[PDB]
Amino acid sequence: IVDLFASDLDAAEINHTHAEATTTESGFLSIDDKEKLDAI
């Protein structure tokens, strides 16, 4: 009897985040960037 999850399967979880987008790598939009875009 063995239990396996996404982490055990070297897989991403359903409720998982991503690295914020930077000047060299893409990713999620940061809170500060969203606030600056909204204020502009």
Residues 1-40 that bind a second copy (CB under 8 A): 4-6, 9-18, 20-31, 33-38, 40
Instruction: Read off the tokens for 30.
Output: 């940061």
String marking each residue 2-31 x if it binds Fe ion according to CB under 5 A: ----------x-------------------
Could you tell which of a second copy, other proteins, Fe ion, none binds residue 39, using a CB distance below 5 to 8 A set by kind? none
Cβ–Cβ contacts within 10 Å for residue 19, how many? Answer: 9
The answer for residues whose C-beta is within 8 angstroms of residue 27's C-beta and 6 or more apart is 18, 19, 20, 21
- Count of residues in contact with a second copy, rule CB under 8 A: 32
